[PDB]
Structure 1
């Protein structure tokens, strides 16, 4: 009787008013008809009208009006289907009326049940490893995710507890079936069966659902750590490595961390804890040889799965090598179609390719048959363990020395213990692959620098822009002298122009002004102070180097300009684009001031790429200028335009230029050619032409 009112209260409590707050013609009239029928049913209940009747009428009145509001709010433009389904599910009390075979309530219930049906129808060392990983499970200094880690370990402790405790309740169910040979207490056991067996995979899903956010934070932390640490400078270590393997080992390391911690806390610790707690549960059930023979079963299954996966891996390697060989022979016979047609190997090459197919497919049969013998001897000893355990329990129940009828517990319990063991055994090759993915990343975490930030690293006192060199040296190898004993002092507002030999000594000198490399001896100073005692970022924040190339990331053009200095608004972007003059290219381009460029976006011409580069350096606004002028010259409008923009960025600036062109070198303050690790001549253009040094030879080279 009260169960119907409780079910009505539970149905009426489907967050009707609560959700209605939270979520904020013929079909609308059909809903208004249901709301009219619900108002009529509630007015019929009020007309029929004790506290249950008044509470029913109150629930009916609120639910009915909520239907009108829900329908009207959809007109002002899922959950109603859930409400109607939950209500129609609660209407299964009807059978309790039929069980009788007062009246006004039956008519009201019959009218309600029809009105709901209408609503639903209308709605339609390993110590170092463990210490480092226990540190790797610690996010940060914030109290909102350590609590979630506590939830994860709490459900992890709950899962094996329920996983061992609910087959005992199944045993209680069948035992009480024998002892009643009661329905109410049997239903109070069956509810534990329902909410227990509908909870194993459910609690595994909740575990993995919070494990997702655990992996989110850990992957963020390790990926940003290694991405910061691969942005240190060791260029000889850099350039021999391609970018693809360098970031592939990083992705393998973060998925190594993910798979490693998730599997070692999800399928290694819990299955060993499950086996241990099963044997100890038997040790509090009955201390006998049963735990020993079941322990023999699980250990034997583990050992055979490991050793036949070790049998599997060599067959997989041989099968991979044979399929690579046959597909290579196939495509390389297909490559020269014309000589395959020139000879009458039309019926021969199919025979030799079929021979290679047979030679691969035999090893394919061997590998798949090894899988067959794995699963075969596996299920054979599983059947033998079930047979031995089931016979010893059968002997026990027919001898009645323990509690009887419990054979279903020991029957399903071996299968339930075994079900994670192959789930482990398929990942023995995987955990060692995770180890070799994480160990190289651990080596990569903490390696080295090439330029070393000495203590006392301070700011760069940008007084005037006066750069002096004093008997300096350099090596990128042993005895490697691309630069040897040069010395100068370049002044503010003046310009050095540099030609070198056919070699990267010019760019190397440009990089050691930048301190992109190191010096073995000598003295390089900027504005009085040595370049090596200071912070690198405060050194290179006052430096603008024009590169000969120009990268274009897959992004838009205002972000590409703000790549010069990211603290800009769009006003300085447009002002720098009008300073360079490349804003008219943005007029010629579609997207306003956000033209998507790069590798897949909108491409560019080479002088315009250098115009985007010089616009980036214009936005960056240093005082120290270092141009890398291309040997690839352009049209004289493009040539004098890039020289005029170089003038507009270089006027009254401390400017240092490497170049091989004419207009740059016919006007500068001093022209230097630096070949074989030394300055080979010094002087202006008129000085080199009046002394006739190697500038005469390179004058013949620029002539032709």
Structure 2
């Protein structure tokens, strides 16, 4: 409902709790009230000028009128520019507020809603929504309210000038122009759609005839395809002629009824002045005043398709404002009493769909200073289990606790502030390398950045790179090798400094110097730490405290490397798979 629209937008014109911009909004509405006042009052002073020309038929008072002509007609576009100039800062604050609100609200967690959507449409609808808000409030307060107020105040000015049929015929003019502009823009839009479809068809046929140059040369369609492409060009250009001729008939019947309204009004004023029943000589006022009233009407009428496009851009954003979470912050959300790092699972379950069991009834209690290593099947059940330690997903039942307390009663940020997960990939934003390291924890100075780079050993890569300690990396910057990308990731987690460690070891192994180097840095970050590792490699699983393979939603075997080799479970099969 438009009542909800107007209430929400009158709220959207309210910046904040600071007294320095509400005053500017008051300046904006003050000049908005001033503009129509001058826009109706200064042609009366033009009428005074020509009337005093007739009555002096004086130069000093005529100059005291001409100064009003100068400072009045040099003020219409000038006050419009001042309005739009402060409207700029209005748009600045409103766009900041709505963009940061929707950018916070698209950073909630609903991952099944996330992953099906690409990033481009998700942020394109956000940009369309903020430019929707901008264009919508600016046009509805700049070219809808003031032009209707101008028409109303023109008819009421005539009602205090002379109450006659003149206001009725001018009202007939403006209403007729409005109605015809709306209905022939509705005539325009189907021609625009058909012309777009035909130009897409002809350009597609053109480029797809150009794609196979060798068969176009193999056959003698050299003079045939130009004829068929000219046929498609004619078939599009006829509809092009129809659309442009529809524009012609729009402007033609528009200017025709404008000329008829000028003719009727000017003849009735001409009859009045030759019959002298009113003040005479005023014909220039009613002459230019119809044009001056009309000049914003096509400025409105070119935006009937635009306001409905703003509506469909803002309504989906309004739906996107307030939707949902997947993990719900329950009340009583408190801190995470990081005593020892002891994580227990008790007959737990999970679903990302209906009856969806990638995990079903596993249970353990991993101790401080000890290491679980996990192999799974050819599936994302391992990463899913890793994500539900993180509470990236939800549980249907069971009991997941960390250090005695359940993971679901608490704040998410105070849960994931004591957690360091190594990802198999590594994003590189288009930025520099000390900011890329401080992405681990942004409260660092550069001393801890350099200390963590010397802890990992990747500072020598920063020596090999140009910019000192600020090497610009990313998509357009300075690129990297994959093990070094994982070295930047482990340097980020080293700077973040948790106690709970969760490695996502890549199945893509590297050179044995790179392999033993990443295992040695994993040792240097994992020594006397509560460590949980998913892996598919050898050196990780031949030393850990317990090795688990979790396939088809269950633990399929339990025990150390010697236990699996002495009982000969599925580790024998995957032993043949790692061999070859």
Measured against the shorter chain, the TM-score band is: over 0.9
Shift of 1:456: 0.0
Please list the CA deviations of residues 578-628 of structure 1 after superposition, one character each: whole Å capped at 9, or x if unmatched: 000000000000000000000000000000000000000000000000000
- Could you list the per-position Cα deviations for residues 481-500 of structure 1 after superposition, in whole angstroms to 9, with x for gaps in the alignment? 00000000000000000000
In the alignment, the residues of structure 1 paired with residue 118 and residue 64 of structure 2 have an alpha-carbon distance, to the nearest angstrom, of: 66
Q: Is 1:185 equivalent to 2:61 in the alignment?
A: yes
Residue 560 of structure 1 deviates from its aligned partner by 0.0
Give the Cα separation in 2 of the matches to 1:440 and 1:515: 29
3-state secondary structure, aligned to 1:498: strand
**Alpha-carbon distance between aligned partners in 1 of 2:56 and 2:228, rounded to the nearest angstrom:** 75
SS at match of 2:222: coil
Deviation at 1:153, TM superposition (A): 0.0
3-state DSSP of counterpart to 1:292: helix
Deviations 1:192-239 (A, max 9, x none): 000000000000000000000000000000000000000000000000
Any idea what the Cα deviations from partners look like across 1:467-492, whole Å, max 9, x if unmatched?
00000000000000000000000000
Supply the distance in 2 between the matched residues of 1:167 and 1:626 (Cα, whole angstroms).
78
Task: Indicate the structure (1 or 2) with the bigger Cα radius of gyration.
Answer: 1
Q: How big is the shift at 1:501?
A: 0.0
In structure 2, distance between residues paired with 1:230 and 1:472: 29
CA shift, 1:665, in A, is 0.0
Deviations 1:404-437 (A, max 9, x none): 0000000000000000000000000000000000
- What residue is the counterpart of 2:305 in the other structure? 429
Q: Distance in 1 between matches of 2:156 and 2:546?
A: 89
**Which residue in 1 is equivalent to 2:104?**
228
Between Structure 1 and Structure 2, how many residues are aligned? 580
Superposition deviation, residue 630 in structure 1: 0.0
Equivalent residue for 2:185?
309
CA shift for structure 1 position 248: 0.0
Matches of 1:464 and 1:482 in 2, distance apart?
A: 29
* Counterparts of 1:698 and 1:335, CA distance in 2: 49
2:462 aligned with 1:586 = yes
What is aligned with 2:563? 687
Equivalent position SS for 2:421: strand
Q: List alignment gaps of at least 5 residues for structure 2.
A: none
Q: Deviations over 1:509-536 (max 9, x none)?
A: 0000000000000000000000000000
Aligned counterparts of 1:656 and 1:454: Cα–Cα separation in 2: 27
**Aligned equivalents of 1:219 and 1:300: distance in 2?**
37
- Corresponding position: 1:199 with 2:75: yes
Q: Report the Cα distance in structure 2 between the residues aligned to 1:524 and 1:455, rounded to whole angstroms.
A: 18
TM-score normalized with structure 2 length: 1.00
Q: What is the match of residue 202 of structure 2?
A: 326
Out of 372, 376, 390, the residue aligned to residue 514 of structure 1 is: 390
In structure 2, how many angstroms separate the alpha carbons of the residues matched to 1:192 and 1:151?
23
Displacement of 1:639 after TM fit?
A: 0.0
Deviation track 1:381-404 (CA, whole Å, cap 9, x = no partner) reads: 000000000000000000000000
* SS of 2:502 mapped into structure 1: strand
Aligned to 1:40: none
Q: In 2, distance between residues paired with 1:328 and 1:383?
A: 45
Q: How far apart are residue 357 of structure 1 and its match?
A: 0.0
Any idea what SS the aligned residue of 2:48 has? helix
The residue matched to 1:594 in structure 2 has which SS? coil
CA distance in 2, matches of 1:519, 1:426: 54
Whole-angstrom CA distance in 1 between matches of 2:355 and 2:60: 93
Question: 1:146 — aligned with what?
Answer: 22
For the aligned residue pairs, the C-alpha RMSD in angstroms reads 0.0
TM-score, length basis structure 1:
0.82
Alignment partners' CA distance in 1, 2:448 and 2:363: 39
Q: Describe the superposition over 1:540-589 as per-residue Cα deviations: whole angstroms up to 9, x where unpaired.
A: 00000000000000000000000000000000000000000000000000
How far, CA to CA, are the matches of 1:460 and 1:425 in structure 2?
A: 60
Name whichever structure is richer in helix by fraction.
1
Q: Helix, strand or coil: the match of 2:372?
A: strand
Distance in 1 of aligned mates of 2:439 and 2:481: 19
Match of 2:254 in 1: 378
**Aligned residue for 2:549?**
673
Q: What is the SS of the residue equivalent to 1:320? A: helix
Report runs of 4+ in structure 1 exceeding 3 Å deviation: none
Partners in 2 of 1:602 and 1:287 — Cα distance?
77
| Offset of residue 169 of structure 1 | 0.0
Q: Are 2:125 and 1:246 aligned?
A: no
